[PDB]
Every structure is written in structure tokens, then in C-alpha cells.
RNA sequence: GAACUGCAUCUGAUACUGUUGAGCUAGAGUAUGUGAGAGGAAGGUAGAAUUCCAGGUGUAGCGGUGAAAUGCGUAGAGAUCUGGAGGAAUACCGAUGGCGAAGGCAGCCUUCUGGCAUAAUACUGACACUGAGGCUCGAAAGCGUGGGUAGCAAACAGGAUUAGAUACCCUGGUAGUCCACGCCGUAAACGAUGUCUACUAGUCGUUGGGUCCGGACUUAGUGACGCAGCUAACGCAAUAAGU
């Protein structure tokens, strides 16, 4: 079955983006809704909302965005599979593209990205690699 | 359950056919029976022969009955040796309608 | 609409010649309505209604 | 069933015992019961007419009614008994008057079963019936040769008769042999095979296991000498000639039957 | 086989709530009474393995129910398996 | 000086995982109504056809091969026709159709029986997926005991071509194949493709249901083409070998 989340949320993005769809939809969790925004804030995507269906249900939809044709997102990868969890210290978070990508950490102030939790001296799970 | 009983009877049996008719009819409702339908076809003429007679009579019932009794009655068929073949099968539901040939 | 055994005017259409039972391909009827057609050729058959072929 | 022994000793290594519980452990009927002394295989003038009879232990006798000539009784089956006479199980009948008597019991046969004998009767097992009243293909038992004189074939354990057809005034039959001879319509048959069918896969494991049903052991004709046998004699291990009886008659696919009384009645025999 | 009334007979007696037909409980008993049926057919018929392998999943269902009976409440499940004999 | 990425100790952080308390239905289940099928097991029975047997009509061939010979035939074969007896399989229907976890499963009625598909309700509320060992099933052949034995046929016999033919062709032919109960546990047991999930253009088929006004729509299987994508290339391509 489905023993993963963040890397269906992943896939879906990828999919998606290889598919160039405007927007992609997804049931909705905190921990996606979070991730999504990280994407957003870091400009991956346009931006990410939440609608709250019925059944005490929610639906997470991510507006995707295309630059000169190709997609936003190069590359999008799971680092922290649920069969084996990579957790690292500050000084050892992986640099995505030499920094010009994004390393996404869930760190314990929040899910946030590689350079921010370098500059917060703070370390985590190193989620996946987006650039 | 329901059960379409098909009777194929000797033509020297024609006279005698409709006696073991009343009697299976009474072993069917002594146990709780109900038959719907009793079709009397007649001497219909066979499309080949079997066992060396052309023509053979045909009778046809349907009726409402345990397992039991069912076997009972298969027991019957088989022992009568003028009834050469017999097609019981089992409908979901009783049908009453007159038959087409008849 | 309803198939049966019994209707040997109905099922004489559709049996061949020599009594073999015509294909779909040549028919043009469903195969749901083939299968119960083949099953009720085989009981009029062994309730000596239809021939098994011209030639016994 | 057969039931294998323990090989805890070299004589119990290959026995096996056929197993009946449902028979009765009580002993049978007084009045029935008969004595039966052993003859040792010896005729009047005391010369061992049969060979390899003889010891065994003693068995009584149960008269069995073959003929059943109480017509239109219903009997039922107290009980199923074993007998020493013969390998069938014999079941006791007692009828409504009371009687008491002995019959070959059928293998579909339970205690409690209701028994019928005339010519108006239900086709079961355990039931006399007339050949005539009796329909084709079906299975059956204890054959009357003789109108009158009681059943004569098929009263061996498992023994099965198929009636296949009817001419005239005879009823063709197959018996387990293979042979087919006429019956005269009138004789009476019983319907079903009879019980103890398992009973030629025991195996009795010793030599004093037929010594207690009384078969003495047998001397080979190659082992005597020419004044005993037309095998004895010769310098080592030989056979000689054609084999033979010690009276003198071949013993292998010689025919000795002469019977022209009965060659009508013999209508064919199987080959295989 | 087993048939309506006594289907609905095995579902009234284990009822937790109203017309629940849903819960473990239940769907135990209801397992459970229909391997008392099936066990006098396969005693009959030795060899009718594909008929052998859903009783079999019958069994394999009972069991995890049971098992996630007794891991969610304790006494409810020792209850369940006195009344039902296992 | 750095390093000795460790170890124990207290101190804080609570996003994630582990342990837990309460709750939800979207994964998986259960209750009711229906439809489809060679799913399985036990019995019965129907019709062609082969074989043998008992007869009638009848005469010199039949059979077979590339050509023949062994074989059957003047003791009446082959052909034809009337009676029986016995075994196996189930033409047509029949379809890259249907069912089954695989192996596999075809005439027809009955008894018992496990799954799947869909229909709107009512229900429990993570019960889920996978699976070291383990156990269940597992084609054909083969083995053991007991039955049956028409066709076919390993082995074996004889006839042919051949330089030889321990073969291909041939005239016969026993085990086996058929049945009951047990072993055997192996196949190119194949989709040469482990199971279960979510996502990713479109097209024409076809089987079983559903809903609409013969068509359009949607479902779980069932095939043939064809993008992105993947591949050493073949090709795979929503039934992935794509992410």
C-alpha cells in the first residue's frame, strides 16, 4: 500500500511538471501543506492552497510554474525514504547544486530550508532535493 | 426450491399415462408440494428415434418440493421403465405461464 | 428478450441444416444470447426436439 | 479395514487384521447353532479324499434361511455377526412374528434396517426379490439355480452379480468370473453386494495363521520322489516334465470339465 | 449454507450497537458460524482444495480480527473468545 | 592549536520517527439486492464415432505407401445391413472469449461448495502491505495397492529406404493414459517481466455490470496500435520494462 506521503506529494509534483500541467492536486496534510509552502516561499512553485472539502477532508493544490518553456522544478528527489531516515548536524546538511538548489530540512523549528537552518546553527531530517 | 420436470412416456404407456400422473401429484403434495403447472402435450413426433420408436408421448410439470422428495422422485423415474428420459431441472422461479407448444 | 428451451420454431432458425448450431459471426446475435441459445439447442437436443445431425 | 500390525517380532511383521466393530462381540443364537466336528479332510472309508485339511479350531454352525420362503414379513436386523463357516458377515432377522434367522448380510446393511421378501417389496439391499420382479443394471446377490432349493452363488464376501439382460424365459448374468450363463426367470435374487469386501486384502503374517483356520501345509511335487509324485526325483533341483497332478493330470491349462447337462446353459465365457 | 434468518439471528445476538453489522465482534461470530456450517461439507468432499482455500481465508480473516480485537480492548476479546469457544 | 566524527551525564527544542490518550473516514473489511462464468467436489444420464462379438445379402480383393512389403482374405475379408457388449473424449457452439493464486478448467440435469463484479444505504474505524523459516496447492511422466482396459501408444516384433537405420514411413503392439486411495514435488511451471500502492496524451476493439438520452458517460478485468519517458538495441508504453 501507500507507505509514503512526502514522496507521493514529490512524485505528484514531478509528474505534473513533466506532464506541464497548470496546477496538481493532492489530498492534503500539515506536513505537505508546510512543504508546499517552503516550495513556495523558495519560488519552486507559484503558490499552494488548501480547500477544505467535506468529510472532514482537505485538498492541497499547488500552482506550478514554467520558465522559457521548461519547468521551474530541474529536479525533485526523496532524500528520507521511510526504509532509511537521514538525519544530519548543521554542518552536515547535503548543499543541493553547490547552494543553488534547496536542500528541504525539517528541522525542530520547523520545516525550513538548508541555508536558513546553516545560518540558525540547527540540524534535522534532510527531506528531499529540489532545484 | 422449484423443479421443471420433463417426461418422455412409451406410446403403449399413452393409455396409462395419466394414472402414475395423479400419483406423482399426490406424493408432491402429501410433502408439503405445490405444482403450478401441468402441460399435456401429446404425441409429439420425435426427431429421431430412440429405442426403436419413432414417436414418443411427452408430458410436462412443474412443481415446488424438498430434496427429498426430489430424490424419492428420480427414484420413481428410474424404476418406471416406460418413462425412457426425464430433464428435471431447477428454476429460481416457479413459471406459470401456458407452455409455447401447448 | 427471453430465450428458452422450449421454443423449437425459434431455435430451428438458428440451428444449421444438418443440425449444427450457426456461429455469431454469421448470426449477429450477442454472446450472452449465444451461450443460452447453444445451452437450449443442447437440452432440446437431448430432450429429442432437435437433431443431433441429418443422418442418425 | 485392514489395519497393519507393529513389526515387533518376526511373525507379527506382516500381519493384518481386517477391523469390524459395528458386528456384534455377543455370542449368536443358542437354537440356531449347530456342531460341526471336523472330518480332517477324510471321507467314510477314511482315505484323505481332500489334501491339506485338517487341525483348526473348532466352529459351530448357523443355519442360514437361503431359501427365505416367509413371503410378505417385515423383519429388521438386530444384529450383524461374524461367522467361521464363511467369510461374509451373517446378520440375524427377527421378524414381527418373532421368528429368528440367520441371512448373508449385504455391505450397504445397517442395524435397525427393515427387510422385505415376496414378490412386492422395495428394490434395497438386503431384499429378496424374483429375478422377474428384479430390473435390469441393477447389483445383486445370493443367485438361485434351482427354483426352490435356496440361494447358491455369490454368498463369498464382496461377491457381485449384474443382471444384463432378459430372454425368454431366462435372465442373462455376469458373475466376477467373467462367465455368462442363463437363470430360469422364476429363481429369487437379493439386491446388493455383500459385506466384508475388504476381506481378500488381509494378509494372515504367519504359517500358524492358516493353521488355525486348518490348512496344513503343502509338499511340492519336485520335492518327492518318482514313487510319490510324477515330479519327484533327480540328482539336484529339477522339474522334468510337463506339470501334473500326483493322480496323473496335467495342472496347467488342461480343461476338465464335462459338463453337457449345463454347456446349453453356458452362454459364453470371457477371455482375457 | 447460512441463511438470512439465521445470518441476522448470529448479528442480533453479537450486536454492540444498533444495527452495527460492522464491528469485530460480529464479524467474528459471523465467521465463525459459517466455518460450523462449511466443516460438515468439507468433511464429506476430501478434496475440494479451491473451496478449502476460502474457508482458509476465512480462518486468516477471523484470526487478524481477533488479534485486533485483543491489541484494542482486552476484555472484550477474552469475552468474544469464551462465548464463541475459541 | 586543530582533530581524535565517539561515550555518560544533566539542560533545552517538538517538524519527523518510537511509546501512548481522544477522535475522523479517504486504505482494508463487514450486512442486505442482483448478475457472469469449462471455479471445485459427488453422482446420474444423452448422442455421433472406433473396437470386438452373433447373424443376412456377396465375391476377390482389402489395407497402406512417393513406390511397395509385413498384415487381413476363398476357413468368405473389405463394402452393406440388423442386433448387442465395453472403454475414453465431449465436434459444431468456440471467439489474442470466460473462471481460477498458480498448476489448470469444455456435452447435459441434480446436490454441496469457495471467489469475483457491480447497486444505493447502514456499519467497525488503520484492523494495512510485504514476508526469513514454516505449511497448503502444484502440468506431464513416474511409483504402490486395487479395478477397468475401445482408441492411441513408450518398450518389443516384423516390413521398408539406407553403405548401415538400434530412427523418420509402415503392419501389429504391452506398460501408461481411465477410476478409488496415497506417494512423487519436478516443466520453456513464461508475460523468460515478484507482490502492493499513487501519478503520467490519445485511439479503435472485446467480455461482465451500472447510469443516462441506437448512441454518449462511467467501473474491475480482457487485447491491437501510439506520445512524453526509459532501454545496448530490440522494444515497453495506464495490463510500463516510465516517475
Known amino acids: 500500500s501507500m507507505q509514503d506521503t512526502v514522496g507521493d506529494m514529490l512524485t505528484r509534483i514531478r509528474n505534473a511538471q513533466m506532464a506541464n500541467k497548470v496546477s496538481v492536486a493532492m489530498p492534503s496534510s500539515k506536513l505537505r501543506k508546510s512543504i508546499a509552502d517552503l516550495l513556495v516561499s523558495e519560488g519552486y512553485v507559484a503558490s499552494a492552497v488548501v480547500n477544505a472539502e467535506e468529510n472532514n477532508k482537505a485538498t492541497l493544490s499547488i500552482e506550478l510554474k514554467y520558465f522559457e518553456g521548461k519547468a521551474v522544478i530541474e529536479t525533485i528527489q526523496r532524500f528520507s525514504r521511510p526504509g532509511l531516515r537521514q538525519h544530519r548536524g548543521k554542518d552536515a546538511i547535503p548543499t543541493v547544486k553547490q547552494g543553488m538548489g534547496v536542500a528541504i530540512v525539517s528541522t525542530s523549528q520547523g520545516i525550513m530550508s538548508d541555508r536558513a537552518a546553516r545560518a540558525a546553527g540547527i540540524g534535522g531530517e534532510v527531506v528531499a532535493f529540489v532545484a | 426450491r422449484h423443479y421443471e420436470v420433463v417426461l418422455l412416456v412409451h406410446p403403449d404407456q399413452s393409455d396409462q399415462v395419466v394414472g402414475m400422473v395423479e400419483r406423482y401429484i399426490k406424493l408432491v403434495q402429501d410433502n408439503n408440494g405445490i405444482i403450478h403447472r401441468l402441460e399435456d402435450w401429446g404425441r409429439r413426433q420425435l426427431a429421431y428415434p430412440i429405442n426403436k420408436i419413432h414417436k414418443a408421448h411427452y408430458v410436462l410439470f412443474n412443481i415446488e418440493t424438498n430434496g427429498e422428495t426430489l430424490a424419492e422422485l428420480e427414484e420413481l423415474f428410474r424404476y418406471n421403465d416406460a418413462i425412457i428420459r426425464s430433464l428435471v431441472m431447477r428454476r429460481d422461479d416457479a413459471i406459470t405461464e401456458e407452455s409455447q407448444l401447448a | 428478450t427471453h430465450i428458452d428451451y422450449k421454443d423449437v420454431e425459434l431455435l430451428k432458425q438458428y440451428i444449421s441444416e444438418n443440425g449444427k448450431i450457426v456461429p455469431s459471426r454469421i448470426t449477429g446475435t450477442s454472446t450472452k444470447y449465444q451461450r443460452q441459445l447453444a445451452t437450449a439447442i443442447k437440452q432440446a437436443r437431448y430432450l429429442s426436439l432437435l437433431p443431433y445431425t441429418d443422418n442418425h | ?272 | 449454507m447460512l441463511t438470512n434468518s439465521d445470518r441476522e439471528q448470529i448479528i442480533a445476538q453479537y450486536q454492540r450497537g444498533e444495527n452495527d453489522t460492522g464491528s469485530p465482534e460480529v464479524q467474528v461470530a459471523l465467521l465463525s458460524a459459517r466455518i460450523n456450517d462449511l466443516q460438515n461439507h468439507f468433511k464429506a468432499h476430501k478434496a475440494d482444495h479451491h473451496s478449502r482455500r476460502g474457508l482458509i481465508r476465512m480462518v486468516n480473516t477471523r484470526r487478524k480480527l481477533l488479534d485486533y480485537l485483543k491489541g484494542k480492548d482486552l476484555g472484550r476479546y477474552t469475552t468474544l473468545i469464551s462465548q464463541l469457544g475459541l
Not at chain 4, 434396517?113 to 429378496?128: F, H, K, L, Q
Not at chain 4, 509338499?219 to 493322480?247: I, L
Not at chain 4, 464335462?258 to 470371457?270: E, F, G, L, V
Request: charged share 25%; aromatic share 4%.
Open chain 4, 1 to 272: 479395514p485392514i489395519v497393519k500390525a507393529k513389526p515387533t517380532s518376526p511373525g507379527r511383521r506382516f500381519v493384518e487384521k481386517v477391523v469390524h466393530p459395528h458386528l456384534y462381540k455377543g455370542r449368536p443364537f443358542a437354537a440356531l447353532l449347530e456342531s460341526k466336528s471336523k472330518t480332517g479332510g477324510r471321507n467314510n472309508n477314511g482315505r484323505i479324499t481332500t489334501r491339506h485339511i485338517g487341525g483348526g479350531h473348532k466352529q459351530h454352525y448357523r443355519i442360514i434361511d437361503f431359501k427365505r420362503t416367509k413371503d410378505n414379513i417385515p423383519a429388521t436386523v438386530e444384529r450383524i455377526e461374524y461367522d467361521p463357516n464363511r467369510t461374509a458377515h451373517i446378520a440375524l432377522l427377527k421378524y414381527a412374528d418373532g421368528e429368528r434367522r440367520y441371512i448373508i448380510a449385504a455391505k450397504k446393511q445397517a442395524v435397525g434396517d427393515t427387510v422385505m421378501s415376496g414378490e412386492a417389496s422395495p428394490i434395497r439391499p438386503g431384499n429378496c426379490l424374483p429375478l422377474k420382479n428384479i430390473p435390469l443394471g441393477t447389483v445383486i446377490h445370493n443367485i438361485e439355480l434351482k427354483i426352490g432349493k435356496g440361494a447358491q452363488m455369490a454368498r463369498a464376501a464382496g461377491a457381485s452379480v449384474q443382471l444384463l439382460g432378459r430372454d425368454g424365459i431366462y435372465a442373462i448374468l455376469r458373475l466376477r468370473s467373467g462367465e455368462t450363463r442363463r437363470v430360469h426367470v422364476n429363481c429369487r435374487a437379493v439386491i446388493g453386494e455383500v459385506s466384508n469386501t475388504e476381506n481378500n486384502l488381509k494378509s494372515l503374517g504367519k504359517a500358524g495363521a492358516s493353521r488355525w483356520r486348518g490348512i496344513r501345509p503343502s509338499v511340492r511335487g519336485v520335492a518327492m520322489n518318482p514313487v510319490d509324485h510324477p515330479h519327484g526325483g533327480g540328482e539336484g533341483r529339477n522339474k522334468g516334465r510337463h506339470p501334473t497332478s500326483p493322480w496323473g493330470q496335467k495342472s496347467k491349462g488342461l480343461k476338465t470339465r464335462h459338463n453337457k447337462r449345463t454347456d446349453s446353459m453356458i452362454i459364453r465365457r470371457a477371455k482375457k
